[PDB]
Amino acid sequence: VKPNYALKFTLAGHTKAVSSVKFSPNGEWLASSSADKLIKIWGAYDGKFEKTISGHKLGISDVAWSSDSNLLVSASDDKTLKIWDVSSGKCLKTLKGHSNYVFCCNFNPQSNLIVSGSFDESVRIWDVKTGKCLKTLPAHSDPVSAVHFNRDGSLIVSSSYDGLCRIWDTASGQCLKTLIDDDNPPVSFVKFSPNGKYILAATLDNTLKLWDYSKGKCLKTYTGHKNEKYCIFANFSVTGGKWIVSGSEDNLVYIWNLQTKEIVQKLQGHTDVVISTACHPTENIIASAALENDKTIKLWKSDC
């Protein structure tokens, strides 16, 4: 079985490259971040522009939702993260401590903690309420491209241009595992699977890999796309068929069957690299976003 994603809406508004898109956990909203220093909020089902959230001094590389859909956190070249109250648009806290660009960010499932990764080669863990840094992990020897908590928040996975994925104990800060396959390309993205068993990792050799975390083994590889330069997000799509979804440097969105590793669809429409994709939590909807020559976000919907 193959899905049939079809283009429904195109969202224009950002004035520079879009850097990340994320659906709110409650399914109502899409948040986007951009090199234009802005966060924009859009209706998840109709693509209707809702509001702009402003405050960063330089471009934003990542934005992420709290699990109750009330807060956002953003990571900026201004070397800060900002915590936002979405309803009021207020910047609640500015998280200062990284010594270089902040590249990636996420809340833990409880949403009492934020994890961040930076060009300063560290991972920081921050208290959401106080906006204060709790731990700094000397995690990598090159910029940190992604950070993500597991299902219960007890672990953090990080990835780096240094070619490593590392798993950290949230509470103690200890490195529990280092994962790397037979070659050492920069690792450009990682995240835990929805069930927490696996880690999905992208490397800048045109490859996505599914790792069994507990066993430290690569189980599956997904290929066919182009990814040698950009830190492109990847997703697990779970509302219909079980897919892996990723942007590509040939301007397409790729969708693979998770189990069989076959490509099941390619989405054409963007005019530049698709840097970010997101999958809606309840409906078969994919959001995709593109770089500077395009500047748009697209919403695609399928019957499977």
């Binding site: 490259a17 850097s19 951009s34 471009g59 241009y161 450009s188």
Partner: peptide, 10 residues
């Protein structure tokens, strides 16, 4: 030059 680390690329 593109304005963010992620949109600039490796």
């Amino acid at each position: 030059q593109t304005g963010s680390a992620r949109s600039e690329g490796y």
